[PDB]
Amino acid sequence: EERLHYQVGQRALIQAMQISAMPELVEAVQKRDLARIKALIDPMRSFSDATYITVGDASGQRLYHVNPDEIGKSMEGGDSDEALINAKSYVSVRKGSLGSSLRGKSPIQDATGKVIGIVSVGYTIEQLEHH
Numbered sequence: 001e002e003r004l005h006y007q008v009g010q011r012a013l014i015q016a017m018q019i020s021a022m023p024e025l026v027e028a029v030q031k032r033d034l035a036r037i038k039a040l041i042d043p044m045r046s047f048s049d050a051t052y053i054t055v056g057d058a059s060g061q062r063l064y065h066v067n068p069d070e071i072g073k074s075m076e077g078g079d080s081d082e083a084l085i086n087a088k089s090y091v092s093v094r095k096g097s098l099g100s101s102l103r104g105k106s107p108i109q110d111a112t113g114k115v116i117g118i119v120s121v122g123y124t125i126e127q128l129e130h131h
C-alpha cells in the first residue's frame, strides 16, 4: 500500500520498454551511430511528458542524454546494473544530474537476447503536476 508515485513509475517503465525494443534503435546502437540515435530519441523526448530519456551502451557509456556533454560519459548512478547485466526492466529512483527522479529502465537487446545497451525514461519528482 506504500507508494512512490506508482503511476508515474509505470508510465516511465512502459515507455522505456517500448523505446528499447525499437528495431531502429537496436540497429543505431549496434552501429554506435550517435546522430541516428539523436534523430530517433529527440522526437520521443519532445512528445513524451517525461523529463528526460537517456540511452546507454552495454558498458553504460551514454549514447544519448538531454545534456550534450554527458554523451560519452559513464552512467555512474549505480542503478543500471540489473538491466545491463541481468536484462531486467524496472522502476528505480535516484538523484542524478537532473534531480531526484523516478526512472523506468529496460535493456536494449539484439535478436539473440544479448544486452547491448539500456534506455532510462525519467520523471523528476519535484516537477510532477500534483493531483
Ligand code: NA
Binding pocket: 016, 017, 020, 021, 089, 106, 107, 108, 109
Ligand atoms: Na527492453
